[PDB]
Design a protein around this ligand. Structure first.
Ligand code: HEM
Ligand code: HEM
Ligand SMILES: CC(C)(C)ONC(=N)/N=C/CC[C@H](N)C(=O)O
Ligand SMILES: CC(C)(C)ONC(=N)/N=C/CC[C@H](N)C(=O)O
Ligand SMILES: C[C@H](O)[C@H](O)[C@H]1CNc2nc(N)[nH]c(=O)c2N1
Ligand SMILES: C[C@H](O)[C@H](O)[C@H]1CNc2nc(N)[nH]c(=O)c2N1
Ligand SMILES: [Zn+2]
Lengths: 411, 407
């Protein structure tokens, strides 16, 4: 079966055959579309087919399908599964797998870069202090003094589900949030619960508006331990505006390295529950979502006030005006400090070229429109006008429950 | 089978049960989501009529009453005898209001119960269609105080006597390709404009020419008619702070009136059912003005503002976009023509969704269409999970009649 997608701006039609290789479910049926829903211990039984599927994919990628080397590796993995009930990936397969999980990540607009990912193998790690050291190294390598380099660090895979490696932080670098007794929040409201955990674990909080959170790291199913990332390793950018000189007096800054640390990487049926990965920011992530969501720093009012916009009626589009100015400031600030950032026009234009390339060479590109379209100026970006098909390919990044909801405390 | 939708800004969770009555299919499967794709007999008819009459009698609290049974009996008799049936006025009005209520792509549905339904099932000629349409235009326009309306022409019979309005909206601007290679007027309408010219329209060959109506009665060849200019309320576009903005010479029409969809009620198909409400500002200022394949005016506006257009990261497009949209709203408001901004409309839709969840058990909604085409995440609909499913009565797409019609 072939499926066609059309761009309604250009009339370019593309044909998808890659969706035939999709195995996992979407959440949708013939009777309900769940496309806007945010979120819609294995036996040998299920493990060998998943491993075989993966190694067939790997050996095809390297022009070695059906080779002696291919056959010997299936045999070796099969015996390892029946003998030990799991298996170990070769380094080459781990690299291939991690790059493909990114290539397959349908919510990711940055995937033109997928083949340039630095994979750090941390599968020899055994303790939280060991995890801390690997994570400092990733941050320093990825940051590269502002010339950001995409990277992933991969800790040991799940075994019995009782010995999991987890990074409890949702990102390696994030700011603390504090709920005040009057009901207001200081800092980032998204991180209040996590910040309360850290404090309970013994972090002494500076209690300001941009406190970089400590790492909370669980090795081998043990209780997590706290570590402060060396401040000299945390690159930050003070936010100012090219024309408005009062903008700096808002006291805003943000960190340069966006590093997702709470997802699960699945490769060939193996589950890597700690696999922090990092790229670089698209400006709207900070300027639209982190600053202007009502449930985040919520700075629209204060900015619009300073601009003396007409705030008595929404139809003045005061929020829209302030929104654009904030986003100019974020891009200006990062570019001026020589910290890698991409604007939403450049990023979406690149994605469309990536997507067309993938259709030609791969037969498809799964993509989640809801996530790919930027949270401001949607229809003046080419992706708004592009029909996409969303389906799930493995290797993949997957959500997993927050570890505080499932952890068995040792004491 | 019982489904939750969460708002991520407010944490409010709603439970959807209404989807279980979903009839038509979505295009999606368990393997693939098609959420962003724009267009994914006697024995057939009786269950459809029954399903509809059942929800109708339920709505007037008369389910299982004799009057309910008797109507079902009568229609069954009528289908058996005539192969079709005729809706009572009460059913027709209920059906059209509900087709709007069920429109998953419509952010304006808080208004769904206030719909003036004009029964045109007695219409027989293109001239009668023109008459009904002028009356709808004048009624809905109401000197700028717009009122929602639908006009319903006769239902499909054997399918070779279809009533159709060939136009995609009652009021739109012409488009002409030039020797230049550029396009004058609205490029969306270039093809329909050619069809009009080939049918005999003398086009005045300008940027904002109101197109003539091309009306097909009774499967006959369609015919041209000019809407009385005095019935077409238009708005010149100026800006509350930029004096040069009026120099661009932009205008738009006050009445958005979709005229190419098919209304399905109780299995009956109404192939000509033009309907109208009023504009949300972004439809004109973001889509009609700034789409690359529409009037595409961002470049000209940015220049006049003297923005740095050397690099995408200055956000010059985004800046001009906001200004264009301020100017659309200001202009309609100044001229006392109903318009709604995207903040107000989306806020209303959230309130409507809650009402529907509470009173009906859900609200089919298509997030891809509901979230405005600018400033998505600063509107509350961005953060609201929505379930998309197909309920009937419904408005459906149908093929353009020039691809179907036999001359
Ligand atoms: C290279 C620079 C990159 C840019 C500009 C980029 C851009 C983005 C953006 C804007 C989102 C949506 C984020 C949000 O709204 O929270 C995203 C999601 C995602 N990206 Fe990329 N990305 C990049 C690199 C990567 C890398 C290196 C990986 C993994 C190796 C990755 C995997 C994903 C995944 C798994 C998601 C979905 C996360 C979720 O569901 O919350 N990205 N990316
Ligand atoms: C009262 C004022 C109304 C407002 C502000 C409103 C708002 C909108 C908006 C912004 C769209 C998306 C249009 C587009 O992007 O092309 C839409 C689509 C839709 N609306 Fe409403 N609407 C209103 C009245 C109505 C009425 C009176 C009906 C039917 C009786 C209706 C049925 C629909 C349908 C069927 C669509 C989807 C059409 C398509 O797929 O192209 N609307 N509406
Ligand atoms: C971590 C990752 C995906 C590799 O980098 N990509 C990226 N630009 N952003 C991902 C999430 C960042 C999040 N939106 C934030 O604003 O902190
Ligand atoms: C009833 C009706 C016609 C849907 O009104 N709704 C509306 N505000 N617009 C719908 C389509 C109009 C189209 N987006 C336009 O910008 O011309
Ligand atoms: C409910 C809805 O799916 C949710 O708000 C999504 C919308 N699209 C998004 N897109 C991106 N990139 N990131 C997000 O957090 C979201 N949030
Ligand atoms: C490809 C994509 O589905 C298409 O561009 C849609 C996106 N969302 C939309 N939303 C509305 N309200 N109107 C539209 O025309 C579209 N176009
Ligand atoms: Zn779907």
């Amino acid at each position: 079966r072939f499926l066609k997608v059309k761009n309604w701006e250009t009339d370019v039609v593309l044909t998808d055959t890659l969706h035939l290789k999709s195995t996992l479910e979407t959440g949708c049926t013939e009777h309900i579309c769940m496309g806007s829903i945010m979120l819609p211990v294995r036996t040998k039984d299920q493990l060998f087919p998943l491993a075989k599927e993966f190694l067939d994919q790997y050996y095809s990628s390297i022009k070695r399908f059906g080779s002696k080397a291919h056959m010997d590796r299936l045999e070796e993995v099969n015996k390892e599964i029946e003998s030990t009930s799991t298996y170990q990936l070769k380094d080459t397969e781990l690299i291939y797998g991690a790059k493909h999980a990114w290539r397959n990540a349908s919510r990711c607009v940055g995937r033109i870069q997928w083949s340039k990912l630095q994979v750090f193998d941390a599968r020899d790690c055994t303790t939280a202090h060991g995890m801390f050291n690997y994570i400092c190294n990733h941050v320093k390598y990825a940051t590269n003094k502002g010339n950001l380099r995409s990277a992933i660090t991969i800790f040991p895979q799940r075994t019995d589900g009782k010995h999991d490696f987890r990074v409890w932080n949702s990102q390696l670098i994030r700011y603390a949030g504090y709920k005040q007794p009057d009901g207001s929040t200081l800092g980032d409201p998204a991180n209040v619960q996590f910040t309360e955990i850290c404090i309970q674990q013994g972090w002494k909080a500076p209690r300001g508006r941009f406190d970089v959170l400590p790492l909370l790291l669980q090795a081998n199913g043990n209780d997590p331990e706290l570590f402060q990332i060396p401040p000299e390793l945390v690159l930050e950018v003070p936010i100012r505006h090219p024309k408005f000189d009062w903008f700096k007096d808002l006291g805003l800054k943000w960190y340069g390295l966006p590093a997702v640390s709470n997802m699960l990487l699945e490769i060939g049926g193996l589950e890597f529950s700690a696999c922090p990965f990092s790229g670089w920011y698209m400006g709207t992530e900070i300027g639209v979502r982190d600053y202007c969501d009502n449930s985040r720093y919520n700075i629209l009012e204060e900015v619009a006030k300073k601009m003396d916009l007409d705030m008595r009626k929404t139809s003045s589009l005061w929020k829209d005006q302030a929104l654009v100015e904030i986003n100019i400031a974020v891009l200006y600030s990062f570019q001026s400090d020589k910290v890698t950032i991409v604007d939403h026009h450049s990023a979406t234009e690149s994605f469309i070229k990536h997507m067309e390339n993938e259709y030609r060479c791969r037969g498809g590109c799964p993509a989640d429109w809801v996530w790919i379209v930027p949270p401001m100026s949607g229809s003046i970006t080419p992706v708004f006008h592009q029909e996409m098909l969303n389906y799930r390919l493995t290797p993949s990044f997957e959500y997993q429950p927050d570890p505080w909801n499932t952890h068995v405390w040792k004491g």
